[PDB]
Design a protein around this ligand. Structure first.
Ligand SMILES: [Cl-]
Ligand SMILES: [Cl-]
Length: 162
């Protein structure tokens, strides 16, 4: 299993503008378009993203293209971030996927806000980091996904996804 497969499980795939768990306009594989209430602001962001007139709908190829860009951007952001980079470098391959997952869903900033959990992952205190990660809005708002990512951190295997 790889990052793409993991995130595809967590975000699903939709070819028409949709609202995410938070009520924000999204398309494809978790590609956030806008936080603006306007469906028109979304359609416009969509056209800009695709470079064509989409009218709120895209093909699977287009969805996958956006997906490739988003994962690449997530990874490059972690590698450029002073707070994230060191955690990342310290982890094993599977657990690195889990940090990418969080950054994809919640942005660099968000993640960088989990100070204490980050410190615990760095020290490799798995069970304790797991407990701390759960004490978050993230866990309360999307418990099944959070559980999956959290289990990945705790065990270092893909069991939660299998
Ligand atoms: Cl809490
Ligand atoms: Cl969930």
């Amino acid at each position: 299993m790889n990052i793409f497969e993991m995130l595809r499980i967590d975000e699903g795939l939709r070819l028409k503008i949709y609202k995410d768990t938070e009520g924000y306009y999204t398309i494809g594989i978790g590609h956030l378009l806008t936080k603006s209430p306007s469906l028109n602001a979304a359609k416009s962001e969509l056209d800009k993203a695709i470079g064509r007139n989409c009218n709120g709908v895209i093909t699977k190829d287009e969805a996958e293209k956006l997906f490739n860009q988003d994962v690449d951007a997530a990874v490059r952001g972690i590698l450029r971030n002073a707070k994230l980079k060191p955690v990342y470098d310290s982890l094993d391959a599977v657990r690195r996927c889990a940090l990418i997952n969080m950054v994809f869903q919640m942005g660099e900033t968000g993640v960088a806000g989990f100070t204490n959990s980050l410190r615990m992952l760095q020290q490799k205190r798995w069970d304790e980091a797991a407990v701390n990660l759960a004490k978050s809005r993230w866990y309360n708002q999307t418990p099944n996904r959070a559980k999956r990512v959290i289990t990945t951190f705790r065990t270092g295997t893909w069991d939660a996804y299998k």
